[PDB]
Coordinates of C-alpha atoms in Angstrom, one line a residue:
Chain D
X286 CA 41.4 -8.6 53.6
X287 CA 38.9 -11.3 54.3
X288 CA 37.8 -9.7 57.6
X289 CA 37.5 -6.3 56.0
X290 CA 35.4 -7.7 53.2
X291 CA 33.2 -9.5 55.6
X292 CA 32.8 -6.4 57.7
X293 CA 32.0 -4.3 54.6
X294 CA 29.4 -6.9 53.5
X295 CA 27.8 -6.9 57.0
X296 CA 27.7 -3.1 56.9
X297 CA 26.1 -3.1 53.4
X298 CA 23.6 -5.7 54.6
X299 CA 22.7 -3.5 57.6
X300 CA 22.3 -0.4 55.5
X301 CA 20.0 -2.3 53.0
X302 CA 17.9 -3.5 55.9
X303 CA 17.6 0.0 57.3
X304 CA 16.8 1.3 53.7
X305 CA 14.1 -1.3 53.3
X306 CA 12.5 -0.4 56.8
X307 CA 12.7 3.3 55.8
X308 CA 11.0 2.5 52.4
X309 CA 8.3 0.6 54.0
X310 CA 7.6 3.4 56.4
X311 CA 7.6 5.9 53.5
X312 CA 5.3 3.7 51.5
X313 CA 2.9 3.5 54.5
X314 CA 3.0 7.4 54.9
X315 CA 2.4 7.9 51.2
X316 CA -0.6 5.6 51.3
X317 CA -2.0 7.5 54.3
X318 CA -1.2 10.9 52.5
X319 CA -3.0 9.7 49.4
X320 CA -6.0 8.6 51.3
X321 CA -6.1 11.9 53.1
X322 CA -5.8 13.7 49.9
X323 CA -8.6 11.8 48.3
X324 CA -10.8 12.6 51.4
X325 CA -9.9 16.1 51.2
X326 CA -10.8 16.4 47.7
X327 CA -14.1 14.7 48.1
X328 CA -14.8 17.1 51.1
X329 CA -14.0 20.1 49.0
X330 CA -16.2 18.9 46.2
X331 CA -19.1 18.4 48.7
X332 CA -18.6 21.7 50.4
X333 CA -18.7 23.4 47.0
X334 CA -21.8 21.7 46.1
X335 CA -23.4 22.6 49.3
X336 CA -22.4 26.2 49.0
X337 CA -23.8 26.3 45.4
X338 CA -27.1 24.6 46.4
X339 CA -27.9 25.9 49.8
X340 CA -26.4 29.5 49.6
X341 CA -28.0 31.6 52.4
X342 CA -29.1 28.7 54.6
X343 CA -28.4 28.6 58.4
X344 CA -27.3 25.0 58.2
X345 CA -24.5 26.0 55.7
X346 CA -22.5 27.6 58.4
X347 CA -22.7 24.5 60.6
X348 CA -21.8 22.3 57.6
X349 CA -18.7 24.6 56.8
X350 CA -17.7 24.5 60.5
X351 CA -18.0 20.7 60.6
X352 CA -16.0 20.5 57.4
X353 CA -13.2 22.7 58.8
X354 CA -13.1 20.8 62.0
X355 CA -12.8 17.4 60.1
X356 CA -10.1 18.9 57.8
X357 CA -6.8 17.4 58.7
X358 CA -3.8 19.5 59.7
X359 CA -0.7 19.6 57.4
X360 CA 1.6 21.0 60.0
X361 CA 2.3 17.5 61.2
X362 CA 3.8 16.6 57.8
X363 CA 7.4 17.2 57.8
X364 CA 9.4 18.4 54.6
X365 CA 10.6 15.6 52.5
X366 CA 13.1 17.6 50.4
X367 CA 16.0 16.8 52.8
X368 CA 15.1 13.0 52.8
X369 CA 14.8 13.0 49.0
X370 CA 18.1 14.7 48.7
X371 CA 19.7 12.2 51.1
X372 CA 18.3 9.3 49.2
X373 CA 19.5 10.7 45.9
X374 CA 23.0 11.0 47.4
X375 CA 22.9 7.5 48.7
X376 CA 21.7 6.1 45.4
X377 CA 24.5 8.0 43.5
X378 CA 27.0 6.6 46.0
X379 CA 25.7 3.1 45.5
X380 CA 25.8 3.4 41.8
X381 CA 29.4 4.7 41.9
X382 CA 30.5 1.8 44.1
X383 CA 28.7 -0.7 41.7
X384 CA 30.5 0.9 38.8
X385 CA 33.8 0.7 40.5
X386 CA 33.0 -2.9 41.4
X387 CA 31.9 -3.8 38.0
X388 CA 35.2 -5.3 37.1
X389 CA 35.5 -8.0 39.9
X390 CA 38.6 -9.4 38.7
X391 CA 40.3 -6.0 38.4
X392 CA 39.1 -5.0 41.9
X393 CA 40.5 -8.2 43.4
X394 CA 43.9 -7.7 41.6
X395 CA 44.0 -4.2 42.9
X396 CA 43.1 -5.3 46.4
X397 CA 45.7 -8.0 46.4
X398 CA 48.5 -5.6 45.6
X399 CA 50.9 -5.1 48.4
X400 CA 49.7 -8.4 50.2
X401 CA 51.1 -11.1 47.9
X402 CA 52.6 -12.7 51.0
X403 CA 49.0 -13.4 52.2
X404 CA 47.4 -14.3 48.8
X405 CA 46.8 -17.7 47.6
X406 CA 44.3 -19.6 45.2
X407 CA 41.8 -20.2 48.0
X408 CA 42.2 -16.5 49.2
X409 CA 41.7 -15.2 45.6
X410 CA 38.5 -17.3 45.2
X411 CA 37.2 -16.1 48.7
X412 CA 37.9 -12.5 47.7
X413 CA 36.1 -13.0 44.3
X414 CA 33.1 -14.5 46.1
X415 CA 33.1 -11.7 48.6
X416 CA 33.2 -9.1 45.7
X417 CA 30.4 -10.8 44.0
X418 CA 28.3 -10.7 47.1
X419 CA 29.2 -7.1 47.8
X420 CA 28.1 -6.3 44.2
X421 CA 24.7 -8.1 44.5
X422 CA 24.2 -6.3 47.9
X423 CA 25.0 -3.0 46.4
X424 CA 22.7 -3.6 43.4
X425 CA 19.8 -4.6 45.9
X426 CA 20.6 -1.5 48.0
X427 CA 20.4 0.7 44.9
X428 CA 17.1 -0.7 43.9
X429 CA 15.7 -0.2 47.4
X430 CA 17.0 3.4 47.5
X431 CA 15.4 4.2 44.1
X432 CA 12.1 2.7 45.3
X433 CA 12.4 4.7 48.4
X434 CA 13.2 7.9 46.6
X435 CA 10.2 7.4 44.2
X436 CA 7.9 6.7 47.2
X437 CA 9.2 9.9 49.0
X438 CA 8.8 12.0 45.9
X439 CA 5.1 10.7 45.6
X440 CA 4.5 11.4 49.2
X441 CA 5.9 14.9 49.0
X442 CA 3.8 15.6 45.9
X443 CA 0.7 14.2 47.7
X444 CA 1.5 16.3 50.8
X445 CA 1.9 19.5 48.8
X446 CA -1.4 18.9 47.0
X447 CA -3.2 18.3 50.3
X448 CA -1.8 21.3 51.8
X449 CA -2.9 23.4 48.8
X450 CA -6.4 21.9 49.0
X451 CA -6.6 22.5 52.7
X452 CA -5.5 26.2 52.2
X453 CA -8.2 26.6 49.5
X454 CA -10.8 25.0 51.6
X455 CA -9.9 27.2 54.6
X456 CA -10.2 30.2 52.5
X457 CA -13.5 29.2 51.1
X458 CA -14.9 28.5 54.5
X459 CA -13.6 31.8 55.9
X460 CA -15.2 33.6 53.0
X461 CA -18.5 31.8 53.6
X462 CA -18.5 32.6 57.3
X463 CA -17.8 36.2 56.7
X464 CA -20.7 36.3 54.0
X474 CA -32.6 29.1 76.8
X475 CA -30.0 31.6 75.4
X476 CA -28.7 32.3 78.9
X477 CA -28.4 28.7 79.7
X478 CA -26.6 27.9 76.4
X479 CA -24.2 30.9 76.9
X480 CA -23.1 29.6 80.4
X481 CA -22.7 26.0 79.0
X482 CA -20.7 27.4 76.1
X483 CA -18.4 29.3 78.4
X484 CA -18.0 26.3 80.7
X485 CA -17.1 24.1 77.7
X486 CA -14.6 26.7 76.4
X487 CA -13.0 26.9 79.8
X488 CA -12.7 23.1 80.1
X489 CA -11.3 22.8 76.6
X490 CA -8.9 25.6 76.9
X491 CA -5.3 24.7 75.9
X492 CA -2.0 26.3 76.0
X493 CA 0.6 25.8 73.2
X504 CA 20.0 33.0 70.3
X505 CA 17.8 34.5 67.6
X506 CA 15.5 36.0 70.1
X507 CA 18.2 37.5 72.2
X508 CA 19.9 38.9 69.1
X509 CA 16.6 40.5 68.0
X510 CA 16.1 41.9 71.6
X511 CA 19.7 43.3 71.7
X512 CA 19.1 45.6 68.6
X513 CA 15.7 46.7 70.0
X514 CA 17.4 47.5 73.3
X515 CA 20.2 49.5 71.5
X516 CA 17.5 51.4 69.5
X517 CA 15.6 52.2 72.7
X518 CA 18.8 53.4 74.3
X519 CA 19.6 55.6 71.3
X520 CA 16.1 57.0 71.4
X521 CA 16.4 57.8 75.1
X522 CA 19.9 59.4 74.6
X523 CA 18.5 61.6 71.8
Chain Y
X300 CA 46.2 -5.4 11.7
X301 CA 42.8 -7.1 12.0
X302 CA 43.4 -8.2 15.5
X303 CA 44.7 -4.9 16.5
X304 CA 41.5 -3.3 14.9
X305 CA 39.4 -5.8 16.8
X306 CA 41.0 -5.0 20.1
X307 CA 40.7 -1.2 19.4
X308 CA 37.0 -1.8 18.6
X309 CA 36.4 -3.7 21.8
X310 CA 38.1 -0.9 23.8
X311 CA 36.1 1.8 22.0
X312 CA 32.8 -0.2 22.6
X313 CA 33.5 -0.4 26.3
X314 CA 34.5 3.3 26.4
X315 CA 31.3 4.1 24.6
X316 CA 29.2 2.0 27.0
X317 CA 30.8 3.9 29.9
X318 CA 30.2 7.2 28.3
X319 CA 26.5 6.4 27.6
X320 CA 26.0 5.3 31.3
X321 CA 27.8 8.5 32.4
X322 CA 25.6 10.6 30.1
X323 CA 22.3 8.8 31.4
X324 CA 23.5 9.4 35.0
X325 CA 24.3 13.1 34.3
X326 CA 20.8 13.5 32.6
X327 CA 19.0 12.0 35.6
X328 CA 21.1 14.1 38.1
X329 CA 20.3 17.3 36.1
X330 CA 16.5 16.4 36.1
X331 CA 16.8 15.7 39.8
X332 CA 18.7 19.0 40.4
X333 CA 16.1 21.1 38.4
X334 CA 13.2 19.4 40.3
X335 CA 14.9 20.2 43.6
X336 CA 15.5 23.7 42.6
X337 CA 12.0 24.2 41.5
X338 CA 10.4 22.6 44.6
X339 CA 12.7 23.6 47.6
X340 CA 13.8 27.1 46.3
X341 CA 15.2 29.2 49.3
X342 CA 16.0 26.2 51.5
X343 CA 19.3 25.9 53.2
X344 CA 19.7 22.1 52.2
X345 CA 19.4 23.2 48.5
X346 CA 23.0 24.5 48.6
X347 CA 24.3 21.2 50.2
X348 CA 22.3 19.3 47.5
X349 CA 23.9 21.5 44.7
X350 CA 27.3 21.0 46.3
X351 CA 26.8 17.2 46.5
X352 CA 25.7 17.1 42.8
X353 CA 28.6 19.2 41.6
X354 CA 31.0 16.9 43.6
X355 CA 29.4 13.8 42.0
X356 CA 29.4 15.3 38.6
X357 CA 32.1 13.6 36.4
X358 CA 34.8 15.5 34.8
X359 CA 35.0 15.5 31.0
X360 CA 38.6 16.6 30.9
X361 CA 39.7 13.0 30.9
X362 CA 37.8 12.3 27.7
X363 CA 40.3 12.6 24.8
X364 CA 39.1 14.0 21.4
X365 CA 38.0 11.3 19.1
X366 CA 38.1 13.4 15.9
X367 CA 41.7 12.1 15.1
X368 CA 40.8 8.5 15.7
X369 CA 37.7 8.8 13.5
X370 CA 39.7 10.3 10.8
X371 CA 42.2 7.5 11.0
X372 CA 39.6 4.9 11.1
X373 CA 38.0 6.4 8.0
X374 CA 41.3 6.5 6.3

């Protein structure tokens, strides 16, 4: 009983430490995402002002290209829906455990059932102390999980806003783009060559295509 | 009779506090589920989240009708 309670308390403490580390990482990611979103909004406003002021200028294309190059890529931002769902489930489980452990005396009496041969006054006091410590740890873990869930929701909202802003800016830049020399050309070709880079379901898709091709050949 | 009424009132207050906590938790869970459905529509994890929410949802069948108790208290 005492050993099991100590193991449960240690597991709860480890889970709380892991949740705190995850919350700190999520807060850092959310701060970075907010800074990126603010920078993207400022860049979009500047690009709109430049397009409105210097329409038809040659430097407008260069400015748009520079803005597109400096625009961050949202593909590196993973979806936070699964993390938010997991955090909500963990918070619900912690709340249920705290509610079940609200009556410390009742929980101790229920745990002592079937072990009266190994229950004494000191054992009961130690069990009550362990129950109180577990309840405090569960409350701290629930608070940490709530903070982490709020941070994750804020980060997801910021990431969605940044993705929408980036898509709008890319569309605007594409619309704007749509609307001596020999030495430069060889240099550009050399630069492009030097900077060149290379980036179940497929089998199932190929099998129906092979069957269709065989049927066509037969017919 | 006064002692019995005081004990019944304490039990009813505890039950009402538990019911209020359960209702607040249910409202929070419903808001979270609505937000998840609005944000991650068409996602595979949405079904798992909905199943977990349904499993964690409390059952009201254990709550007895309080109309008879209210009528007896009024009488």
